[PDB]
Amino acid sequence: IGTGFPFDPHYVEVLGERMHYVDVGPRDGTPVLFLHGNPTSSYLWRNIIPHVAPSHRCIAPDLIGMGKSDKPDLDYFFDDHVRYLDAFIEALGLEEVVLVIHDWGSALGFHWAKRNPERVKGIACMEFIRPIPTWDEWPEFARELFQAFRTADVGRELIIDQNAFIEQVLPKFVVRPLTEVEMDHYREPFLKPVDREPLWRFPNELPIAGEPANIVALVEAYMNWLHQSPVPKLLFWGTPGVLIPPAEAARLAESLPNCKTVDIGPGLHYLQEDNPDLIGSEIARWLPAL
């Protein structure tokens, strides 16, 4: 598994802030837009993109306040990310797209898809955000941790002061051991504690136990759209998973229209770090059929 990030940097100005993105592959057909989540960046996609780039344009932005993108003094609510991503897509003059999405990147992607259904040609997804009705549906191996993340004072102490989302959550949710080089790549955006605001707000935006109500409503909305959309879908899952356990992937395999599922083997949350070659190769095999 490659530790390097051999991609020329690109920046586009979005609402007075520069957003970094990877942009490789041929420029004529439909682009594949890769959307990371918390606490990652386009670095998450580094070993997946090379399978896809030979045949298709790969665009992978770093979300505002993350990766190599500018870091405005925002609250970094989900709605903030929505506004910047909406503006990024229009800034590049993208028409139709294929989405490849994960975690908060999936919330963003699905919400964009619901609002622009005519412009989405396919969705490849993995460990995506769905309503979590109770904490019983959250893996026992991370229940107290994320409960603490959403507790007053304690949450900020763990995520901001101690950098728990980088130093604990990342290794905890990758089955194979991450190298020091890989950790340093993930560390680089958040060397300054103050810049960890998005890493704390994201877990506090998760639709868990009916709160926050607005996000629950929004996620329910795009899941309702997804369940009745004819757009081709490719769902990657792992055992035992985090957001999408095997049993959930099985239900989605039946319920989601026009959906193919791919079992990546052992996986938690950052499936891209466990089996990037299978994820990349399957996306590549899938795209020409769109």
Active site residues: 103, 127, 269
Q: What is the 3-state secondary structure (H, E, C) of the chain?
A: CCCCCCCCCEEEEECCEEEEEEEECCCCCCCEEEECCCCCCHHHHCCCHHHHCCCCCEEEECCCCCCCCCCCCCCCCHHHHHHHHHHHHHHCCCCCEEEEEEEHHHHHHHHHHHHCHHHEEEEEEEEECCCECCHHHCCHHHHHHHHHHCCCCHHHHHHHHCCHHHHHHHHHCCCCCCCHHHHHHHHHHHCCHHHHHHHHHHHHHCCECCECHHHHHHHHHHHHHHHCCCCCEEEEEEEECCCCCHHHHHHHHHHCCCEEEEEEEEECCCHHHHCHHHHHHHHHHHHHHC
How far apart are the C-alpha atoms of 16 and 14, rounded to whole Å? 5
Q: Is the peptide bond before 240 cis (omega within 30 degrees of 0)?
A: yes
Q: What is the largest CA-CA distance in the chain?
A: 50
